[PDB]
Each structure stands twice: as C-alpha cells, then as structure tokens.
C-alpha cells in the first residue's frame, strides 16, 4: 500500500539562503501529502536582491512552474538550475519523508 509522504509544506517563504552548498528550508510545517502519488518539491528563486524558497507536496505526473519533474525518485533534494527570465531559478524534488527540508546545491 502506497502511503502519502511527509513533506515540508510552507508554500512560498522568504529565505536568507544563498552562497551555500547545503541549506535548511526552515519550514515549520511537515505535512502529509493529500494524495499518495505526490512527492516533495523545493524551488529556489533569487529575483533581484530578494531570495525566496517554496516547499510543497506535488504530483510528479504534472508540471510545476511549467517544468517536468525529472528527479521525482531521488532520496535527497538536489537543486537543478532552470532558466527563467531575469531571475535565478532552482528546483528539486524527492521521494523521502521531509526530504525537501535539507536542500543541496
């Protein structure tokens, strides 16, 4: 029986996280994903001078920010840099409990 996963689920939050290899999401909500097929997602955005981190539960058979989840099976959340206009955009996904809490660059 596939059971829902534990993911950090704080939606979009501000972050003082950059110029570091590893980094904690500092999210205070560990949530049970509403659907068993969902996986943990972390997305890193540094628009101009303001950094923002987002943690959600998300179905991998579905696009997030119009991107296809490539690593919806990996244990840890290793960020991969996507290209978005005028912005530094990173995103990762993983299939471990609270795996998007510790974020690897």
């Amino acid at each position: 029986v596939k059971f829902p996963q534990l993911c950090k689920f704080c939606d979009v939050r501000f972050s003082t996280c950059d110029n570091q290899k590893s980094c904690m999401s500092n999210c205070s909500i560990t949530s049970i994903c509403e659907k068993p097929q969902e996986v943990c997602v972390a997305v890193w955005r540094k628009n101009d001078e303001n950094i923002t981190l987002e943690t959600v539960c998300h179905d991998p058979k579905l696009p997030y920010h119009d991107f296809i989840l490539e690593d919806a099976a990996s244990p840890k959340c290793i960020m991969k840099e996507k290209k978005k206009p005028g912005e530094t955009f990173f995103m990762c996904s993983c299939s471990s409990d609270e795996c998007n809490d510790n974020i690897i660059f």
Binding site: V1, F3, I32, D97
Partner: protein
C-alpha cells in the same frame, strides 16, 4: 472484509478478518529471525492517512522491514 495472516491465531488456521490493514514485520536479531504478522483495525491506524505503525520503522541496529497491504493474505513477505 480483509483476510490477513496472523501468527497468533492458532484457532483459525492462523488468520484474522480485519477492517483496516494487514501487517507484517521482520526483525533481524543476530541469533534468530522474527516474523510478526497480524491484523490492524481501522481505529488503530493513526493517522489514517499515514498510519505510523506502517510508517518506515527501520532504526539503528535492527534491520526491521514493516509492510502494510490490503489484499487478502498479502502479508506473506
């Protein structure tokens, strides 16, 4: 209703009828292999969305593999 393997159900060919889920767990002691199979009732599955008893329960030292399923006589692994 679900039919699970039960290693204590001597009277009933080692089987119980459950409203929740079938359970099985193999613990690795360095001198014996423990095979616990039982029924878990719906009210004892907390939280129902992610029962902890089924949750990953492999801590340091014990190679414990806990499975939960909802097919009849599925906890035979």
């Amino acid at each position: 209703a679900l039919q699970c393997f039960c290693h204590l159900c001597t009277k009933d060919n080692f089987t119980c009828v459950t409203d929740g889920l079938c359970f099985v767990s193999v613990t690795e002691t360095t001198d014996k292999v423990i095979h616990n199979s039982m029924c878990i009732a719906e009210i004892d599955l907390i939280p129902r969305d992610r029962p902890f008893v089924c949750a990953p329960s492999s801590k340091t030292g014990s190679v414990t593999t806990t499975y939960c399923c909802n097919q009849d006589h599925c906890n035979k692994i």
